[PDB]
Amino acid sequence: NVSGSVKLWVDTTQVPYYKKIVANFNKKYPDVKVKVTQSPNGSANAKTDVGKDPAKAADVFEVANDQLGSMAEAGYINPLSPDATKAVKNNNVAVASEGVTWKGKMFAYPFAEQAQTIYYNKSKLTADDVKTWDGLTAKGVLATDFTNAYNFYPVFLSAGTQLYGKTGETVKGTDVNSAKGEQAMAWFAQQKSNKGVMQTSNALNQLKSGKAAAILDGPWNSANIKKILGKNFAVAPYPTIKLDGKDVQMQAFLGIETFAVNSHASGSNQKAAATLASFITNKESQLIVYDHSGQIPVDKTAQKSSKVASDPVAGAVMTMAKPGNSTLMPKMPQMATFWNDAAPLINGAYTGSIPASQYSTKLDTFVKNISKA
Numbered sequence: 001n002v003s004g005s006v007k008l009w010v011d012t013t014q015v016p017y018y019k020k021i022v023a024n025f026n027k028k029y030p031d032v033k034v035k036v037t038q039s040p041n042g043s044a045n046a047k048t049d050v051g052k053d054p055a056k057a058a059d060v061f062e063v064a065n066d067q068l069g070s071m072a073e074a075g076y077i078n079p080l081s082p083d084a085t086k087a088v089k090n091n092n093v094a095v096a097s098e099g100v101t102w103k104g105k106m107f108a109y110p111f112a113e114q115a116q117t118i119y120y121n122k123s124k125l126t127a128d129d130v131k132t133w134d135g136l137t138a139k140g141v142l143a144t145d146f147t148n149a150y151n152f153y154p155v156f157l158s159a160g161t162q163l164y165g166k167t168g169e170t171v172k173g174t175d176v177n178s179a180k181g182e183q184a185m186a187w188f189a190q191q192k193s194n195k196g197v198m199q200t201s202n203a204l205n206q207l208k209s210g211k212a213a214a215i216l217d218g219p220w221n222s223a224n225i226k227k228i229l230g231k232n233f234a235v236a237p238y239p240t241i242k243l244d245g246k247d248v249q250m251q252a253f254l255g256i257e258t259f260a261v262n263s264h265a266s267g268s269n270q271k272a273a274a275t276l277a278s279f280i281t282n283k284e285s286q287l288i289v290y291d292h293s294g295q296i297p298v299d300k301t302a303q304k305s306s307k308v309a310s311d312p313v314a315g316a317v318m319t320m321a322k323p324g325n326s327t328l329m330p331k332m333p334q335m336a337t338f339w340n341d342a343a344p345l346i347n348g349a350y351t352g353s354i355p356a357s358q359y360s361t362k363l364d365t366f367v368k369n370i371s372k373a
């Protein structure tokens with residue numbers, strides 16, 4: 001019998017439907033007491049929410065796949081059992097398994113596939129307009145944030161550089177300190193004078209007011225944006241961009257959203273936590289998340305269901321997940337330093353705080369900073 005008491009951390013607006021999922025869980029596991037709350041700072045900050053005091057953190061918590069290597073090496077999460085590993089591998093798409101695997105072992109329970117797309121108001125821009133960055137921004141305003149490296153670091157990947165090597169597993173493998181990296185820096189800088197590019201900390205509000213015709217965003221906002229745009233809703237994969245005078249696809253990161261089990265839980269509570277993590281990432285639960293938020297399941301069967309298959313956001317995400325259109329986020333322990341250092345690199349190029357005469361130096365220093373043992 002599974003019994004115990006578990007705390008579950010989810011992101012703010014997810015609480016209502018995780019309570020529904022937990023009610024489903026409790027039909028099968030009536031002797032597990034679950035408390036569902038928001039986390040202190042959300043799934044994009046699980047590393048530091050848990051690391052501040054692992055023994056006081058939730059037993060099961062939402063976390064993006066890039067954070068897993070750091071958390072595994074710190075001992076905050078343990079490997080999944082053989083049976084749990086088999087279920088993850090068999091039920092979900094291959095990239096979901098890759099996303100949670102570190103040194104040959106799975107460390108979390110994947111549930112959603114995340115790639116950003118263009119969301120746009122089709123009364124302001126056409127499907128043809130959004131195929132290229134320069135064409136889109138010549139015709140309407142794209143609102144975005146150059147201080148968030150999750151948005152723009154993948155331009156370096158479009159430029160032909162590697163992040164932690166060919167596999168994302170090589171500490172010294174980032175090669176952005178190159179002429180190709182400089183092409184990306186120049187692209188950022190070009191956007192400052194692009195009248196169709198608006199820097200904002202809240203792109204969603206600009207879409208809502210009609211001051212932006214398009215934004216780059218992820219599927220955690222799919223249902224939100226469908227509500228904002230109504231009959232004018234449209235979505236597309238990322239456009240091409242011009243780097244060194246050549247059109248190339250602009251990449252996004254591919255992320256896998258997961259739940260992980262805190263290694264501090266023990267005894268019955270540990271078993272209950274693992275059971276909960278497995279249940280809330282099962283097919284039925286993934287489809288409940290989809291119904292409420294529009295996030296894209298990783299379950300193989302759920303992706304093929306008619307509601308998911310007919311959703312234009314799902315189609316655009318599965319295009320973005322193809323080779324060449326995105327790169328799976330690495331999960332190296334160095335990733336937290338990478339994110340911290342990448343944002344000023346990119347934003348400095350955009351604002352001109354880093355002039356072109358400094359691109360090579362700044363890229364060299366960046367690679368040194370993010371490549372330490």
Ligand SMILES: OC[C@H]1O[C@H](O[C@H]2[C@H](O)[C@@H](O)[C@@H](O[C@H]3[C@H](O)[C@@H](O)[C@@H](O[C@H]4[C@H](O)[C@@H](O)[C@@H](O)O[C@@H]4CO)O[C@@H]3CO)O[C@@H]2CO)[C@H](O)[C@@H](O)[C@@H]1O
Pocket residue numbers: 011012042043044045046047048064065066067114148149150218220255257336339340341
């Ligand atoms: O140094 C800057 C920050 O670096 C680190 O943040 C990283 C994360 O570790 C990455 O996972 C990623 O974050 C993505 C995230 O993967 C993605 O899911 C999405 O997050 C949504 C979330 O799904 C949704 O439920 C709700 O919470 O809104 C979120 C968006 O606001 O988008 C994230 C990016 O915006 O990239 C960031 C870097 O931006 C580190 O964790 C931080 O502590 C640090 O500040």
Ligand SMILES: *O[C@H]1[C@H](O)[C@@H](O)[C@@H](O)O[C@@H]1CO
Pocket residue numbers: 010011012013038039041042043044045
């Ligand atoms: O996904 C975001 C939510 O929108 C915030 O409310 C909070 O939960 O942080 C996460 C990201 O970590």
Ligand SMILES: [Cl-]
Pocket residue numbers: 092093094095
């Ligand atoms: Cl697959």
Ligand SMILES: [Cl-]
Pocket residue numbers: 133134240241242243
């Ligand atoms: Cl361009």
Ligand SMILES: [Cl-]
Pocket residue numbers: 264265266267269270
């Ligand atoms: Cl415990």
